[PDB]
């Protein structure tokens, strides 16, 4: 039995989002629907992306580093190479284990890309391991097509690149034609001023590999992923609430959920067309949450783009199989 | 019942070490003993530490920023506040909420010191939140006495100050008398070149709050670590194996028992002078795991301070409360 994937501090505050590990404290619903496969697993014990369930840290050792121009001081670092080369990968070819699952946002000169997700590290020198230290930054990630000259954004890790560029100047540019990159894991959502912005990523900038199924509507229920707070680069102290607005990430699932729906085979569990239900208990009124074989969430919100505040949840019990066509409660 | 907070899952490479969040590898006993409170929880449902059972994001909005010692081409910036001035850290206000439990590795020019916490991450203006962008950099971050004219190393909290400075060269630096920090909470091993060094941290160098309880071998039962494979700057693609060496960092406990610790009191579960028991089946043979009320492990390995490697860990099944007194069962 699935029930105890989800149990009452996965939401209440222990649990985190499979995309940028912050702690979940929203459900936002999607009804135009969406995708996910990077650290998504489903209930046969399969994950269609490139990362396990963890958020340690990105590491690919052949790329091609550079920088614009004749002056190697306060340049922004360029990092690039080509989906389907992270040989090193045991899970897939496609990116390093936790290359975030978005695509790349281009900028240049003083622009600080908006809505990028960006960790912190640099490159390192291929032939020994040692890293070039004067290239630690913060980096934006992300699959592109285009690059070096001109990167625009692609959806698809079918023919793309996987790019680095640091949103400020490092303290030397180093130009390699072959040089590694190193980046923590656990990423910050890029903003050039103090305001935030809508949840991200939206569904548009998610990268999936192919045969990657879809979440849709399903009658009145709707796809949703999990908001959590998530530190942004124009102003990196705010946290939730009074300061300056709050800033949501979001991901397809709690961590703990991937976990573990990647330790076990939930196949005898679970028919297709079945949702396994939760009853999410409020101080006030109550809601259903199910979740489908192919591993994605869903509330009977319908057409409501409206985010789910998870601030009074007070505990949560199994409800069990039940048809993916049954309306799903919500009764808040 | 204690019995699920250790699982086959949590030693065979998925559960972290509670310090470094590194996937545990190995246990390492302590027949000198340690001591250990930050992300450290016992079975009464309580920390001596300051630091959520996480790894996010190391905060403080009130500390001294400056560069002294520094040229135009290297520039290590300092940042120090007092130790109990984390006035906004819910659990403990002696350190923000992540800050590492290592004493400070002094270090000057271009030299790297050995054996240090080190993080990415920045400066940041505390009147508004944006980031001082051109002082991100790998920071290694320590408890010190004699800033900043002298940091040196201490292992109490009491009186201290909680230190970080670049190990790098900042691409510019900044002098606020009031500056925020801001450092990811996973952290890597600070090494001068590509060799690792001993597992870490040492004993000698972790830092405790007053009142923590130490781990001392009871008869023939000595407290261990756990050991997981840690980044170090030197060689940071190394991982295990390495032919440069594996490093190893260590945690007293893994994070998914801390994370179960602190979410319900076991305080009826055991009592002191008693283990709880678990049983580790190897591929050829076993051993037996016991842990206190504190909340430390042990094992009946006496005076060895090999490490112990968990690739032939098969599974662990929960033996039961036992007399800690009694010798923990080693037949490997
Ligand atoms: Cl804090």
Redesign the interface.
């Given at each position: 039995s699935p029930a105890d994937l989800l149990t009452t501090?996965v939401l209440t505050g222990?649990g985190?989002d499979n995309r940028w590990?912050?702690?979940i404290v929203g459900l936002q619903p999607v009804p135009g629907g969406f995708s996910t496969c990077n650290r998504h697993w489903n209930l046969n014990g399969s994950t269609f992306g490139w990362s396990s369930p963890?958020?340690?840290?990105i590491?690919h050792?052949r790329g091609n580093a550079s920088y614009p121009g004749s002056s190697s001081s306060?340049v922004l670092e360029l990092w690039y190479a080509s989906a389907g080369s992270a040989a090193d990968n045991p899970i897939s070819q496609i990116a390093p284990d936790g290359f975030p699952d978005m695509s790349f946002v281009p900028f240049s000169g003083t622009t600080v890309p908006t809505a990028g997700w960006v960790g912190?590290?640099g490159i390192?020198n291929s032939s020994?391991?040692?890293?070039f230290?004067?290239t630690?930054?913060?980096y934006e990630l992300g699959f592109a097509t285009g690059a070096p000259s001109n990167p625009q954004p692609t959806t698809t890790t079918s023919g793309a690149q996987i790019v680095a560029k640091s949103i400020?100047?490092?303290?030397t540019g180093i130009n390699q034609a072959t040089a590694?990159l190193?980046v923590?894991?656990?990423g910050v959502i890029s903003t050039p001023n103090?305001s935030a912005i809508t949840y991200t990523p939206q569904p548009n900038r998610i990268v999936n590999a192919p045969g990657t199924p879809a979440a849709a509507p399903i009658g009145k229920n709707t796809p949703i992923m999990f908001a959590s707070v998530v530190?942004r680069?124009?102003?990196?102290?705010?946290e939730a609430g009074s300061?300056?607005g709050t800033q949501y990430g979001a991901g397809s699932q709690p961590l703990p959920v991937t976990?573990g729906l990647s330790?076990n085979n939930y196949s005898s569990a679970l028919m297709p067309g079945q949702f396994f239900v939760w009853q999410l208990n409020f101080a006030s009124g109550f809601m259903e949450l199910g979740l489908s074989v192919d591993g994605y969430f869903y509330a009977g919100t319908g057409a409501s783009a409206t985010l789910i505040d998870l601030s009074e949840l007070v505990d949560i019990r199994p409800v069990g199989p039940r048809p993916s066509t049954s309306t799903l409660v919500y009764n808040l």
């Open positions: 501090p222990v985190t590990n912050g702690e963890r958020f340690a840290a590491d050792d306060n912190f590290g390192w020994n391991g040692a890293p230290v004067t630690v930054q913060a400020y100047g490092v303290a590694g190193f923590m894991a656990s103090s530190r680069t124009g102003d990196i102290n705010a300061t300056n976990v330790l």
